[PDB]
Amino acid sequence: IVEGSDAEIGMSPWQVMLFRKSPQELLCGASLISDRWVLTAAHCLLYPPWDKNFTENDLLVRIGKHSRTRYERNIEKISMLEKIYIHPRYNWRENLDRDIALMKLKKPVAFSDYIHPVCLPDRETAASLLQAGYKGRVTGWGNLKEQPSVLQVVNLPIVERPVCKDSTRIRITDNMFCAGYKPDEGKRGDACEGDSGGPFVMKSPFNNRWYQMGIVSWGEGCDRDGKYGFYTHVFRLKKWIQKVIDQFG
Amino acid sequence: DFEEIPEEY
Amino acid sequence: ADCGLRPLFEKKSLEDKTERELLESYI
Ligand SMILES: N[C@H](CC1CCCCC1)C(=O)N1CCC[C@H]1C(=O)NCc1cccc(Cl)c1
Ligand code: NA
Ligand code: NA
């Protein structure tokens, strides 16, 4: 995260770290959506231009974390993957369309003050919250500019789709939205390398619950003036998520 | 740069 | 059931330092 701030303890108890087994290192961000399912970006798992193709056994899930590098004894929990499910129409070849994956845990994780699932939006929450100017929150342990001691947080406004489209040469789809400040806005901030797969969340003013509206997906550079970060539109791929869980739950 | 995790896991 | 309600914040009626920035943008 660029130009963010240190998270408060328990501020993002759905935050997950995707952790490589050898060599031991941060792969990606992710989020907890129930006691056995974790949501992330497909590109965290499969990205042939970079020779990335992980299988269950290559990785661990670390939940409840705050510090990036420390083993947080008595707080974090470390989980093994039973199964990875990647969107069957994920487009890694051109624009990262449908950049989404689910991970099923071998065993359920115990909830705690530091470990708790985020909600996924229904259609009316999506309709109400996904509006230009409305701010969400992105969290991660990624690069501080184009590494932090602890989890970082930044609040960013959703940007209007024509602006999103005009800021890039990439073909933008309905399954993405972009967020970030304009040069004329003063404020700045962005996701960056390492934050991939982490959640963009919003707090519903109707029922005061946090909802994950986006997944950190791509950006040309990090916190560049005139450029925006792009997020997978979780509500738009809801059917697929429901299908996977309802079948393999 | 990461603290090692328990052997288990 | 309980999704999206944080033990150290909503469950205790405590607010984090910047959530009100989000609320204020929901115009
Ligand atoms: N710079 C690339 C641009 C992407 C654009 C779509 C087509 C593949 C290349 C990119 O963002 N990639 C290439 C592979 C993964 C992803 C990434 O680094 N995402 C992390 C990231 C960085 C900054 C902002 C965000 Cl929102 C996410
Ligand atoms: Na209400
Ligand atoms: Na920017």
Instruction: Please check whether residues A169 and A113 belong to one and the same domain.
Output: no
Kindly report the number of other CB atoms within 10 A of residue A240's CB atom.
16
Ligand 1: which of A96, A143, A188 to mutate, judged by most atoms within 8 Å of the beta carbon?
A96
Instruction: Please check whether residues A105 and A142 belong to one and the same domain.
Output: no
Answer yes or no: are the C-beta atoms of A180 and A36 closer than 8 Å: no
Domain tally, chain A: 2
Instruction: Please check whether residues A68 and A141 belong to one and the same domain.
Output: no
User: Would the CB atoms of C21 and A135 count as touching at under 8 Å?
Assistant: yes
Instruction: Please check whether residues A146 and A188 belong to one and the same domain.
Output: yes
The helix/strand/coil state of A63 is: strand
Nearest to A10 among C3, C6, C22 (CB): C6
Mind listing the domains of chain C with CATH numbers? 1-27 (4.10.140.10)
Distance between CA atoms of residues A149 and A96, nearest Å = 29
Kindly report the number of other CB atoms within 10 A of residue C10's CB atom.
19
Q: The domain containing residue A127 runs over which residues? A: 1-12+118-235
Please give the full DSSP string across C1-27, using - where no structure is assigned. --TT--TTTGGGT---SSHHHHHHH--
State whether the beta carbon of A43 lies less than 6 angstroms from ligand 1.
yes
Instruction: Please check whether residues A36 and A150 belong to one and the same domain.
Output: no
Q: Give the β-pairing of A199-203 and A135-140.
A: antiparallel
Instruction: Please check whether residues A38 and A100 belong to one and the same domain.
Output: yes
Instruction: Please check whether residues A182 and A126 belong to one and the same domain.
Output: yes
Instruction: Please check whether residues A143 and A208 belong to one and the same domain.
Output: yes
State whether the beta carbon of A96 lies less than 6 angstroms from ligand 1.
yes
DSSP structural state of residue A247: H
DSSP structural state of residue A132: T
List, in sequence order, the alpha helices (H) in chain A.
Answer: 123-129, 161-166, 238-248
Distance between CA atoms of residues A44 and A232, nearest Å = 13
Instruction: Please check whether residues A79 and A182 belong to one and the same domain.
Output: no
Taking alpha carbons only, the member of A170, A185, A174, A163 closest to residue A126 is A174
**Tokens 């969400």 appear where?**
A136
Instruction: Please check whether residues A106 and A205 belong to one and the same domain.
Output: no
Residue B4 contacts A where some CB pair is shorter than 8 Å: yes
Instruction: Please check whether residues A36 and A78 belong to one and the same domain.
Output: yes
User: Would the CB atoms of A69 and B4 count as touching at under 8 Å?
Assistant: no
Answer yes or no: are the C-beta atoms of A214 and A120 closer than 8 Å: no
Taking alpha carbons only, the member of A89, B4, C15, A69 closest to residue C23 is C15
Q: Is A43 a catalytic residue?
A: yes
What CATH number does residue A143 fall under? 2.40.10.10
The rounded Å distance from CA A21 to ligand 1 centre is 23
Burial of residue A162 (number of CB atoms within 10 Å: 0-12, 13-18, 19+): exposed
Considering only CA atoms, give the Rg of chain C.
Answer: 10
Q: What are the beta bridge partners of residue A61?
A: A18, A79
Distance between CA atoms of residues A177 and A230, nearest Å = 6
Which residues 6+ apart lie within 8 Å of A215 measured at CB? A31, A39, A40, A41, A99, A100, A197, A198, A199, A200, A231, A232, A234
Where are any strands of DSSP class E within A2-124?
5-6, 15-21, 24-32, 37-40, 46-47, 52-53, 59-63, 77-86, 101-105
Residue C9 contacts A where some CB pair is shorter than 8 Å: yes
Instruction: Please check whether residues A105 and A203 belong to one and the same domain.
Output: no
